[PDB]
Amino acid sequence: IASGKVWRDTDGNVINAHGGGILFHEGKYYWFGEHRPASGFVTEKGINCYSSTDLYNWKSEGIALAVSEEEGHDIEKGCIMERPKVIYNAKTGKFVMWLHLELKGQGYGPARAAVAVSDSPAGPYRFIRSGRVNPGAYPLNMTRKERKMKWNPEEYKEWWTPKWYEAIAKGMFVKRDLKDGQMSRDMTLFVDDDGKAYHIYSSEDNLTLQIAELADDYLSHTGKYIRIFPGGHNEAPAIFKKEGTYWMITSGCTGWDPNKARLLTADSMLGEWKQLPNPCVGEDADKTFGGQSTYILPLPEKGQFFFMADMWRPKSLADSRYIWLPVQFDDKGVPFIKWMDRWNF
Ligand SMILES: OC[C@H]1O[C@@H](O)[C@H](O)[C@@H](O)[C@H]1O
Ligand SMILES: OC[C@H]1O[C@@H](O)[C@H](O)[C@@H](O)[C@H]1O
Ligand SMILES: [Ca+2]
């Protein structure tokens, strides 16, 4: 594994699977990610898939979730499709893909999540719907008192005042968004020990992370969710569980520019989370080695985990590279990440 270099599939073509993630099913790894074009910032083709038995050699499986050709469709060509993730639902035997969708021609304003489903890992995936998350529902961890507070929008027009920040912390944008649903941009999925799945996403104008329970078929949200680090600008979440404890790596909010990573931890998915120092160590750790978090893959056969990141190139997004590095653990069990030029499983 040679982070930062040009990686090619088994036909000699450049691997094009950004903002991605991996699952293992019936003996093979499947890597889903954004097909990015050589120019621009929209999705021309959709979500790409690659497969491998060894994590070194990747066969192109083609587009797993294609853009629609129907005019006015949610995923019409020219929408923005980002950070796709796939989880296998054991109950229904289906593959469920969630992704960040922004409607064609509307920049990043819509802030939706979208869901699609397939009987096979590589697709084709069938689009079901898009929208903002859990319309009408409050977070479990907003008290009755906090839920009663009202916030006149004309009094809070200026961002980053003391009163505005407090208001954001106490849930002013949760209430603003309560009718039509919570905003969802950068996102991930996690399937827990008990078969419950969670949708983790940057909400409230990117200011606040939310963690939402999915229904038993993984196709919708139950209404149960929490909100964490309000005003923190945690983005690009990646998450794993080890020995009962949850660990989440996130970026800051600086568009395509790299920034300092954060480590977050909890002893229950919907309990209280705490922030720890940057998990990246050594030279360039302050810039996440020039990358941005996308996924943490468990390798449960080994009791190991590895960290996947993107090295973004906004001038030609298809030239964006991949950083994959092992997760290491200190003598207290706290995960950390060191750069290695080349490494092996
Ligand atoms: O993100 C997709 C959304 O779809 C909506 O129809 C639903 O009301 C939301 O709770 C959410 O599941
Ligand atoms: O909007 C430009 C980019 O901003 C990043 O912060 C985000 O993680 C990406 O998925 C993309 O949306
Ligand atoms: Ca958001």
Cα(317) to centroid(ligand 1), Å: 29
Expressed as residue numbers, the domain containing 104 is 1-345
Ligand 2 atom closest to residue 235's alpha carbon, by position in its atom list: 8
Contact by Cβ (8 Å): 265, 248 = yes
Contact by Cβ (8 Å): 33, 14 = no
Ligand 2 atom closest to residue 82's alpha carbon, by position in its atom list: 10
The residues, any chain, with a CB within 8 Å of residue 250's CB and separated by 6 or more, are 209, 234, 235, 236, 237, 238, 261, 262, 264, 293
Choosing from 47, 83, 233, 254 the residue with most ligand 2 atoms within 8 A of its CB, the one to mutate for a pocket test is 83
d(CA 320, CA 311): 5
Resolution in A: 1.8
Ligand 2 atom closest to residue 185's alpha carbon, by position in its atom list: 12
- On the question of a cis peptide bond just before residue 139, with omega within 30 degrees of 0, the verdict is no
Element (H, E) at 169: helix 162-170
Query: Residue 259 maps to which CATH number?
Result: 2.115.10.20
This structure was determined by X-ray
Total domain count for the chain?
Answer: 1
φ/ψ of 288, rounded to 5, equals: 55, 40
CB atoms inside a 10 Å sphere around CB 302: 8
Any long-range contacts for 210-218 (C-beta under 8 Å, 24+ apart)?
210/133, 210/139, 210/182, 210/184, 211/269, 211/270, 212/133, 212/134, 212/182, 213/270, 216/91, 217/89, 217/91, 217/92, 217/94, 217/96, 218/87, 218/89, 218/92, 218/94, 218/96
DSSP state of 7: P
Structure tokens at 250: 């996130």
Cα(256) to centroid(ligand 2), Å: 6
The Cβ-side half-sphere exposure at 193, using a 13 Å CA radius, reads 9
Specify the pairing of strand 321-326 against strand 292-299.
unpaired
Contact by Cβ (8 Å): 1, 324 = yes
Structure tokens at 270: 């919907």
Cα(111) to centroid(ligand 3), Å: 6
Coil, strand or helix at 303: coil
Coil, strand or helix at 60: strand
The residues, any chain, with a CB within 8 Å of residue 72's CB and separated by 6 or more, are none
d(CA 278, CA 83): 22
d(CA 105, CA 87): 29
d(CA 172, CA 156): 10
Structure tokens at 300: 């449960």
